[PDB]
Amino acid sequence: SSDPLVVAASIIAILHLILWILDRL
Amino acid sequence: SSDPLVVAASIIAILHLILWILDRL
Amino acid sequence: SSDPLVVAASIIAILHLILWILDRL
Amino acid sequence: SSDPLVVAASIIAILHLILWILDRL
Numbered sequence: 001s002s003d004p005l006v007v008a009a010s011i012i013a014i015l016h017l018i019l020w021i022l023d024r025l
Numbered sequence: 026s027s028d029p030l031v032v033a034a035s036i037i038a039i040l041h042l043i044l045w046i047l048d049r050l
Numbered sequence: 051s052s053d054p055l056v057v058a059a060s061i062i063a064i065l066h067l068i069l070w071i072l073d074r075l
Numbered sequence: 076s077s078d079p080l081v082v083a084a085s086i087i088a089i090l091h092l093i094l095w096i097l098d099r100l
């Protein structure tokens with residue numbers, strides 16, 4: 001398993017790419 | 026748990042979304 | 051090991067650097 | 076212990092913030 005602060009920071013990263021891919025889209 | 030350079034890069038990522046969110050106000 | 055969301059976000063980031071060193075190689 | 080693709084992914088993270096403290100306030 002990974003640290004929680006880490007799983008958070010990633011979710012923040014994964015959601016960013018989405019809002020990007022919609023902003024662009 | 027999770028490797029510390031990986032807790033590092035994270036504290037930076039979260040803190041970054043903070044400064045940014047704040048940058049709008 | 052490290053959670054999957056983190057191995058996912060990471061692949062993005064490594065693939066992010068990749069899409070750069072090329073866009074400007 | 077975090078995945079390697081993840082420990083790597085974060086050197087390029089910690090290496091970004093560095094090029095940054097090296098540019099602006």
Ligand SMILES: N[C@]12C[C@H]3C[C@H](C[C@H](C3)C1)C2
Pocket residue numbers: 006009010013031034035038056059060063081084085088
């Ligand atoms: N930008 C990221 C920092 C750290 C490593 C990787 C996954 C998470 C945690 C988000 C990219």
